[PDB]
Scaffold this active site. Sequence first.
Site, PDB file in Angstrom:
ATOM      1  N   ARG B  15       4.432  13.935  13.235  1.00  0.00           N
ATOM      2  CA  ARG B  15       3.336  13.125  13.435  1.00  0.00           C
ATOM      3  C   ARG B  15       4.136  11.901  13.925  1.00  0.00           C
ATOM      4  O   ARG B  15       5.133  11.729  13.915  1.00  0.00           O
ATOM      5  CB  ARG B  15       2.359  12.911  12.405  1.00  0.00           C
ATOM      6  CG  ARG B  15       1.910  14.070  12.016  1.00  0.00           C
ATOM      7  CD  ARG B  15       1.142  13.785  10.600  1.00  0.00           C
ATOM      8  NE  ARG B  15       1.916  13.890   9.380  1.00  0.00           N
ATOM      9  CZ  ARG B  15       1.429  13.564   8.236  1.00  0.00           C
ATOM     10  NH1 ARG B  15       0.105  13.174   8.002  1.00  0.00           N
ATOM     11  NH2 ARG B  15       2.066  13.663   7.203  1.00  0.00           N
ATOM     12  N   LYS B  75       4.843   7.788   7.462  1.00  0.00           N
ATOM     13  CA  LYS B  75       5.340   7.954   6.152  1.00  0.00           C
ATOM     14  C   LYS B  75       5.942   6.460   5.868  1.00  0.00           C
ATOM     15  O   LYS B  75       5.905   5.667   6.509  1.00  0.00           O
ATOM     16  CB  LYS B  75       6.147   9.139   6.187  1.00  0.00           C
ATOM     17  CG  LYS B  75       5.683  10.397   6.300  1.00  0.00           C
ATOM     18  CD  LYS B  75       4.480  10.661   5.683  1.00  0.00           C
ATOM     19  CE  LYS B  75       4.488  11.401   4.232  1.00  0.00           C
ATOM     20  NZ  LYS B  75       3.613  10.866   3.227  1.00  0.00           N
ATOM     21  N   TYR B  94       1.427   4.778   5.427  1.00  0.00           N
ATOM     22  CA  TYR B  94       1.180   5.282   4.362  1.00  0.00           C
ATOM     23  C   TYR B  94       2.372   5.190   3.272  1.00  0.00           C
ATOM     24  O   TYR B  94       3.391   5.614   3.524  1.00  0.00           O
ATOM     25  CB  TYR B  94       0.948   6.939   4.270  1.00  0.00           C
ATOM     26  CG  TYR B  94      -0.587   7.569   4.865  1.00  0.00           C
ATOM     27  CD1 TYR B  94      -1.598   7.303   4.310  1.00  0.00           C
ATOM     28  CD2 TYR B  94      -0.419   8.438   6.021  1.00  0.00           C
ATOM     29  CE1 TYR B  94      -2.778   7.662   4.947  1.00  0.00           C
ATOM     30  CE2 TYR B  94      -1.569   9.165   6.469  1.00  0.00           C
ATOM     31  CZ  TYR B  94      -2.742   8.308   5.907  1.00  0.00           C
ATOM     32  OH  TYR B  94      -3.834   9.128   6.418  1.00  0.00           O
ATOM     33  N   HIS B  96       1.909   4.723  -0.741  1.00  0.00           N
ATOM     34  CA  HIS B  96       1.814   5.587  -2.170  1.00  0.00           C
ATOM     35  C   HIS B  96       2.681   4.562  -3.137  1.00  0.00           C
ATOM     36  O   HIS B  96       3.482   5.476  -3.814  1.00  0.00           O
ATOM     37  CB  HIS B  96       2.401   6.817  -1.821  1.00  0.00           C
ATOM     38  CG  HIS B  96       1.305   7.844  -1.333  1.00  0.00           C
ATOM     39  ND1 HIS B  96      -0.130   7.959  -1.441  1.00  0.00           N
ATOM     40  CD2 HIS B  96       1.450   8.187  -0.047  1.00  0.00           C
ATOM     41  CE1 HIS B  96      -0.675   8.579  -0.712  1.00  0.00           C
ATOM     42  NE2 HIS B  96       0.366   8.781   0.352  1.00  0.00           N
ATOM     43  N   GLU B 118      -3.740   3.848   2.802  1.00  0.00           N
ATOM     44  CA  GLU B 118      -4.551   4.732   1.843  1.00  0.00           C
ATOM     45  C   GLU B 118      -5.307   3.815   0.940  1.00  0.00           C
ATOM     46  O   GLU B 118      -6.145   4.396   0.094  1.00  0.00           O
ATOM     47  CB  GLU B 118      -3.823   5.627   1.216  1.00  0.00           C
ATOM     48  CG  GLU B 118      -2.694   5.088  -0.071  1.00  0.00           C
ATOM     49  CD  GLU B 118      -1.370   4.470   0.382  1.00  0.00           C
ATOM     50  OE1 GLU B 118      -1.238   4.560   1.797  1.00  0.00           O
ATOM     51  OE2 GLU B 118      -0.589   4.001  -0.152  1.00  0.00           O
ATOM     52  N   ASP B 264      -0.081  18.349  -4.656  1.00  0.00           N
ATOM     53  CA  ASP B 264       0.952  17.253  -4.965  1.00  0.00           C
ATOM     54  C   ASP B 264       0.680  16.417  -6.183  1.00  0.00           C
ATOM     55  O   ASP B 264       1.537  15.937  -6.781  1.00  0.00           O
ATOM     56  CB  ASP B 264       0.842  16.367  -3.898  1.00  0.00           C
ATOM     57  CG  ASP B 264       2.133  16.396  -2.789  1.00  0.00           C
ATOM     58  OD1 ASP B 264       3.273  17.147  -3.331  1.00  0.00           O
ATOM     59  OD2 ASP B 264       2.182  15.683  -1.972  1.00  0.00           O
TER      60      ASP B 264
END
Lengths: 366, 366, 366, 366
Positions: B15, B75, B94, B96, B118, B264
């Site tokens: 992506r 990412k 993103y 996390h 997110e 996950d």
Amino acid sequence: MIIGVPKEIKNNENRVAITPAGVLSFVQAGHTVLIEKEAGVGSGFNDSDYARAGAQIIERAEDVWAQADMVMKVKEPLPSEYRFFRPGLVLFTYLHLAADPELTRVLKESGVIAIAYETVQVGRTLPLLTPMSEVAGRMAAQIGAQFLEKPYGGKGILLGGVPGVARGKVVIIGGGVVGTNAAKVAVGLGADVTIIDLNADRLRELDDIFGNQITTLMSNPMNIAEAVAEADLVIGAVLIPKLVTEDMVKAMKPGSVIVDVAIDQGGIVETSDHVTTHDNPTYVKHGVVHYAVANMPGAVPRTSTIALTNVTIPYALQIANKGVMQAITDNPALELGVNVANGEITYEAVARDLGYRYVPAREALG
Amino acid sequence: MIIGVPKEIKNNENRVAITPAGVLSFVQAGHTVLIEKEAGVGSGFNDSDYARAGAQIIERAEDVWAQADMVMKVKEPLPSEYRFFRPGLVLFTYLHLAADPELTRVLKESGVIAIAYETVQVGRTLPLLTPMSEVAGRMAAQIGAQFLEKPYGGKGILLGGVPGVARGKVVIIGGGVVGTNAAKVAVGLGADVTIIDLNADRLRELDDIFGNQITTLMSNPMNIAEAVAEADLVIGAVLIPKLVTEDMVKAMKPGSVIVDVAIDQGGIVETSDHVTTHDNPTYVKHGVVHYAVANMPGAVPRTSTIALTNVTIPYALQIANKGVMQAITDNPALELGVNVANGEITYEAVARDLGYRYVPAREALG
Amino acid sequence: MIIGVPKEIKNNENRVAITPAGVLSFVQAGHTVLIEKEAGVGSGFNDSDYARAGAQIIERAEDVWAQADMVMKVKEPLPSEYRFFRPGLVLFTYLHLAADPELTRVLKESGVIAIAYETVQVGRTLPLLTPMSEVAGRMAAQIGAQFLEKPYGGKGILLGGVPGVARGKVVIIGGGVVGTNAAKVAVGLGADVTIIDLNADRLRELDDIFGNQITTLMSNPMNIAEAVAEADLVIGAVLIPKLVTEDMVKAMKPGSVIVDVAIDQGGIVETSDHVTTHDNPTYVKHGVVHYAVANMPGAVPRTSTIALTNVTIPYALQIANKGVMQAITDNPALELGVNVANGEITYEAVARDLGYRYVPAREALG
Amino acid sequence: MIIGVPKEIKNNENRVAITPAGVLSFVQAGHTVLIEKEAGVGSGFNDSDYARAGAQIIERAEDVWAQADMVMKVKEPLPSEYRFFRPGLVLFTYLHLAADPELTRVLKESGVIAIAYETVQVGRTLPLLTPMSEVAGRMAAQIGAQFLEKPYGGKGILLGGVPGVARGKVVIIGGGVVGTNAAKVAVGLGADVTIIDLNADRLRELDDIFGNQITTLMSNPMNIAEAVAEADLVIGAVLIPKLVTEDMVKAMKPGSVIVDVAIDQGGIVETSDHVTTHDNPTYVKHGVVHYAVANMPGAVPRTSTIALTNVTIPYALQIANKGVMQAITDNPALELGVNVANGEITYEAVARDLGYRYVPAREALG
Ligand SMILES: NC(=O)c1ccc[n+]([C@@H]2O[C@H](COP(=O)([O-])OP(=O)(O)OC[C@H]3O[C@@H](n4cnc5c(N)ncnc54)[C@H](O)[C@@H]3O)[C@@H](O)[C@H]2O)c1
Ligand SMILES: NC(=O)c1ccc[n+]([C@@H]2O[C@H](COP(=O)([O-])OP(=O)(O)OC[C@H]3O[C@@H](n4cnc5c(N)ncnc54)[C@H](O)[C@@H]3O)[C@@H](O)[C@H]2O)c1
Ligand SMILES: NC(=O)c1ccc[n+]([C@@H]2O[C@H](COP(=O)([O-])OP(=O)(O)OC[C@H]3O[C@@H](n4cnc5c(N)ncnc54)[C@H](O)[C@@H]3O)[C@@H](O)[C@H]2O)c1
Ligand SMILES: NC(=O)c1ccc[n+]([C@@H]2O[C@H](COP(=O)([O-])OP(=O)(O)OC[C@H]3O[C@@H](n4cnc5c(N)ncnc54)[C@H](O)[C@@H]3O)[C@@H](O)[C@H]2O)c1
């Protein structure tokens, strides 16, 4: 020609062999139509409706049959009507002569030209029986839903469930006119519907009609056993050794329902060995409710009358315009309708089954 | 503002955080966009496409990150990219962070304004996560169908059957974005599909969307046990004690398949306790195939890129036009995106989970 | 009669020529069925299932073929099985004799009555080939979707897109059994689907089945060129000079996919000139992925077995009840199945293509 | 906590306030469940089913109510059950206290904590009444179809007609939960369906759900008069001056049917002024059949039980885990359920309507 339509007299028979629409077809083509009082009323057609279409309303059954060249009905003449027979009278109705040795004998010896709706045939189909098959299949899913209500002996479900609750399983055996019409209503009630048929091409046709709305299943004894055991409602859609056995019915869940449309002919379900009346409509065997009332279309007389008359009258109109002889010459489908004419049994299978000499209708009418 | 989009460097990440459509939005509003060579190629967008939209193509990752006010990615930065961080750099991707103590520490101490896709949130939804949920659910039914092929370990059926053959049973657990997107594809493959949800209003909404095309089932342990035992394919559609237990999986038919989209995060299926790579994608427990590859959307990078960039760039464009401070003042949804700014952890749950002092982003940026 | 069903021995052949449902049909009609150990297991039917239906389980291939009047299979006997042939043995299976000069010679000279599933024919259709065509078309759209995933060489899209993202273009060439079954799955995956056919009446039939769910396109070289260039996935649905030319494939977008169902027979796509194994399933020409694995139905052995056996066994049952001679007298469709009997080549096109004297099966069996 | 579920004792009440699925939810969370013998049997759940889920089966009603902390039911306690009341007992069931001055007085003075399913409320909806509304609407169209059969007094049509015959006209008044559920079944029976609603946004929502499958009609007296006159079946779908007047009913065609779901509350149809039993289910006024049986959901006890228990038990489980006080603190929806606690009327509208002092449930329980 003069056409007469008496009121049906069999018990609770509410259909009628003509509608104002039929009357008007006959009147426009030069003919006269007589209707006995209250003939249409069970089907919600009144004397005023028939009169407005151009029919004469006749007080007494007797005068309709006497003044008419051709009488049209839905059911067979009862003994109480043998009196109205006469030589050269045309009777057009449902006859079932192969199973009525007595009626056949009186029609033969009375000189009646008797034309059976159920033996008019184009190819492999009987076009004047199709409408009651269609009505019957539509009704089967509706009656199935009713008898799944706890008050009527059923386990007490909706075929459609409600959100968060599983749907009922409808298994239809036979994917022709009756079964295909039942599947439309059973899918519309929100059931998981499975249609079982011997003929893989018919299953392909059903998959093109219904798509994902059904499951098509090849007919063999294991497919039927397994499908029937999981079924809330089984519909026997095969009019023609039994496809659903007592052992298969025994494996069904209590309060399940079986509607077998061929109940009159023995059925395809072993447990459905007898017929019942509107007031006592089911029996239970192995916990399973068996709907035993015959003549489902009889429960929706108005739909059944219109569906019947939509296809009977265009045939009747050939007879009115051309007389029986020219009509059956010109139209081989109508020819196969003539069961009795002028002393003879004019339909092979009736002659064979009852022991008379097959005489072709054209020959017989000479 | 100058916006930079490096090529993603995580293993097999195809992506990319902008498309020509995105470039053109930025260029029309006065901005400059830099794209590293081959950034778009895994998603089938070429340097010529980005150049034609008005972007500069940059040879080296390093020069994109150095020349840009804001870097956009898909990412998290890898350690190999910590070198490109700098005080006042905006990173939009993103992140996390709650599960990456180390990345958070380097972003904090490097002076990065780090905005997490997110944690942008309007009401109860995260609008920059929705697109991957949608893609994920669409993929789950497709992957389920593949692993039901005998060569991939499955019992060897089509979900749709063929005429005369029963359909496969798909049970989807969770009727939100992931599950609803899976049900569309599973119904389209011709499966009997059941959607299980806790929330009866969501089941009512699904019944209004899908009608008779599905079965809605209330979520409780007996409904799940019974549904999962009958299932050819189970899809765990709940991203957030386990809903499908080992005993439930043990009751399943050999060669059945389980796709758990929250693999996950541990999963909702007890047996699905570990993740796997593209080259070793399943394991079998109790005869049941468990698809263990994470990042399903990663298998359709071009759809996933367009779906992501369709919603990320209008947010990125507020930052380009107004600078971070005005953008997060004007837009509370974007505000909740800021995880790290100017020395501080600016998102409560990250601060709490990792042991730093929550400092509001507006305060932090003063 | 005694019927025997060995385990298929060709590489990775998981189908089987009978199911418990088949066994029970034979046992109910007076017959004996023998099944070799693990015959059904690739199709998820166990020895216990066959035994419960009333079959004997036989340790060794050899004893099944020796004790049986008729052997049923899915594939052609391999050389390793010539040993089990014997004069008067009935073999019922897929034969492809016109392309197997050697097998034909051994069947002829071994005295085998060899009946080919693929030459039983009613009108213009082969009813024992239809099920694999149906399975094949359903599979083609599913395999197409898989090879559009980036990990399998595709450009990385969902055929259905997601909200706000364009759908994939599926072009199906041929609108018969294979193509119509593919269109159902491709529409269900959410693709823009176009079905190309020579026959305008078939396009009218597809428009009545599918409505607005597809585009129907007349087949000519410009319509195909233009459609194939715009296509994410092309499905060659014509089993029978090439309809898709290298120049047409060259105009396609990189990462597009071509599934040609007639790959075994050369294909309708020029670039698809060779077949491949499950472990090496594609090649790329002009950036376009070509799925080269034959026997798609082989990937869903359980569906394929049930679909096959649903139609083979009712034919096999005529042979069991009446013996070959009466069965082929009574049933012209079965007659055209007999390829080899009693020293002679009994199917014209096999005799012609390989240079033997056509001898009618009835004559040959006297 | 110990939960007890007696058998319902009102006449022909076949529902039950828990299923094995419910029992298992309680047992897994540490609780004990008692079920009286034959509690579930009217809903086709047997003592063995409850026992297998982990419940104790109790011989006598009395011992269930005595040993339990909380009793769950479907209907109100009858006088024959006042004996089992006790101070601190939790009763969770349908109460209708505003219309039962006597039951309220005995619950108050017996020291019962009485929680009404029908007053639990989230926003504008009552989530423990929704399931019976849904069932009721599904049933209304099915009952309508039955009473259109000539044997049940109807004019004798199928709502769907058959090919070549017009469809029946179904007019549904009210497009909420009841009406929307009725429209699904009436469209599925093949009727021309018109849904009348006051609220133009609800009509827009119905147009997005149903599309061309219905006609949406704004509610005003001329639209209703004109629609009802043309209607074969009218369904009063408004539970809350009369919308259908005697003059409107007088204009209807003889043998038409009216199902008014609010018949218990007076109805929206003037002619439907009284209720009737299963054995005498209709009366005729102005030629129009009026279905007068209340508690339609009572005719499908198994669906009704599952639909009810799917939503009652998750509320009951909060009480079991936390005790009433914490449960109603934590859950305002449950709070509005408490009608009676500890000497006081704890629901405003019950206090007002019957002349007691409203005392908040939290205050009342201190
Ligand atoms: N008098 C008759 O019963 C008869 C005979 C031939 C045709 N028809 C025509 O059909 C109508 C009667 O309706 P119908 O639906 O019963 O007949 P139909 O011919 O329309 O359909 C019967 C269906 O049952 C299927 N079937 C037969 N044996 C089966 C088995 N063992 N298991 C499963 N499926 C099986 C057939 O393949 C066929 O699709 C008449 O209106 C007429 O048009 C009537
Ligand atoms: N980070 C998150 O997981 C999260 C949390 C809230 C909302 N969201 C939003 O939803 C998307 C994530 O997709 P999603 O489909 O997993 O979430 P979703 O909120 O759209 O749907 C989850 C569904 O699971 C159901 N559910 C929960 N517990 C269940 C149980 N025990 N049994 C059965 N059903 C159960 C819920 O009722 C809900 O309908 C994001 O794009 C975002 O828009 C994300
Ligand atoms: N052995 C065969 O290939 C063969 C031949 C005749 C019929 N069949 C029957 O059909 C099945 C085989 O499936 P199928 O779908 O390939 O055959 P089919 O006959 O069902 O369909 C082939 C379709 O391709 C179309 N077509 C032919 N040339 C075309 C062209 N140049 N461009 C576009 N469309 C073209 C035809 O009009 C037809 O609709 C078998 O099961 C059997 O029932 C088989
Ligand atoms: N106790 C109640 O009657 C009540 C009141 C509020 C909401 N509810 C909720 O709705 C369910 C009850 O079902 P329902 O379908 O009767 O209520 P509902 O609120 O779902 O629908 C009633 C519908 O009738 C319409 N309506 C009102 N007056 C009308 C008129 N004069 N002409 C035409 N349409 C008119 C409304 O616009 C509404 O769409 C309960 O399950 C609960 O969830 C119950």
